[PDB]
């Protein structure tokens, strides 16, 4: 099914932002991006700059399959999660 890649990406974003898990990347900060569809490249470019972590490693691979101010990785992933769910609903799987 062609919605599998996005479904799995969404599901990974959820897994790594569970309340139980520690604050993502120890509160490292990344460039915020404009979430407007076809933003997978830009999202990868923000995340690939976070060295180590490992918690976002799977998200980084997942974004690869798709490809002026800073915010916490936690907030970045949560805002991206919400956006992708809306894309999923509208049938944008690419």
């Amino acid at each position, epitope marked *: 099914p062609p919605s599998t890649a996005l479904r799995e990406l969404i599901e990974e974003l*959820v897994n790594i932002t569970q309340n*139980q898990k520690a604050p993502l990347c120890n509160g490292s900060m990344v460039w915020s991006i404009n979430l407007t569809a076809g933003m997978y490249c830009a999202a990868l470019e923000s995340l690939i700059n976070v060295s180590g972590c490992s918690a976002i490693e799977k998200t980084q691979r997942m974004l690869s399959g798709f490809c002026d101010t800073k915010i916490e990785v936690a907030q970045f992933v949560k805002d991206l999660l919400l956006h992708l*769910k*809306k894309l999923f609903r509208e*049938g944008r799987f690419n």
Partner: antibody, heavy 121, light 108 residues
């Protein structure tokens, strides 16, 4: 922007009811309608969805076979017919605006005021 | 797909009420919330996890993470007494799922 529902109906067991829902203030055929019922003092139950664009339908699993949804574009009206009625179909039947998409179901922003159907011998 | 709500929540006037909606990876779904008073149709209060339609008080907010979505109502009033229903779309056998409903009692 409103959904206008037909009046309360009293029906015998085994009869059929057709409830109407008229749309006002928006472009009817750019959306869908979901039907949701509620037996008195109980929860919401989704009955199905119809596209006002093409008349495609998707019925709730518990209602497959028993329900028919139709639209009349000329009057911006949707119809829900429930057949082979039983005492346990006594409920308020609501129509609500939904997306015209056959892929995804959306939130229900606009609701009709509901039509009580009482099923009694 | 199954949504689970507590049947009831009680709250004192002016306090904050929290209503949960549990489902497996509900965080991966867009959650909507309806308020319903007796004799009236449901009213959409929160859509897409945490957005408010126009005319809904800013006292209403929504969160969705992991296996739990939450509707929060700050500074509760007697006019907030109602049944609250969470709702999702699912790609499986039931395309629309409602939670069982939570009765919010405001202890006046």
């Amino acid at each position: 922007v409103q959904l206008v529902q037909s009046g309360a109906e009293v029906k015998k067991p085994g009869a059929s009811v057709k409830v109407s829902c008229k749309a006002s203030g928006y472009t009817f055929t750019n959306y869908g309608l979901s039907w949701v019922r509620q037996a008195p003092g109980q929860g919401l139950e989704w009955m199905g969805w119809i596209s006002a664009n093409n008349g495609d339908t998707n019925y709730g699993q518990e209602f497959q076979g028993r329900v028919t949804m139709t639209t009349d574009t000329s009057t911006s009206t949707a119809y829900m017919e429930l057949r082979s009625l039983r005492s346990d179909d006594t409920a308020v039947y609501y129509c609500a605006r939904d997306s015209s998409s056959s892929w995804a179901r959306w939130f229900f922003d606009l609701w009709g005021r509901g039509t009580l159907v009482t099923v009694s011998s | 797909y199954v949504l689970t709500q507590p049947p009831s929540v009680s709250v004192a006037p002016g306090k904050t009420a929290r209503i949960t909606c549990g489902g497996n990876i509900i965080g991966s779904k867009l959650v909507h919330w309806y308020q319903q008073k007796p004799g009236q149709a449901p009213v959409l209060v929160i859509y897409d996890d945490g957005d408010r339609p126009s005319g809904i008080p800013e006292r209403f907010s929504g969160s969705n993470s992991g296996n739990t979505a939450t509707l929060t109502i700050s500074r509760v009033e007697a006019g907030d007494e109602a049944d609250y229903y969470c709702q999702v779309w699912d790609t499986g056998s039931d395309p629309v799922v409602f939670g069982g409903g939570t009765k919010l009692t405001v202890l006046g």
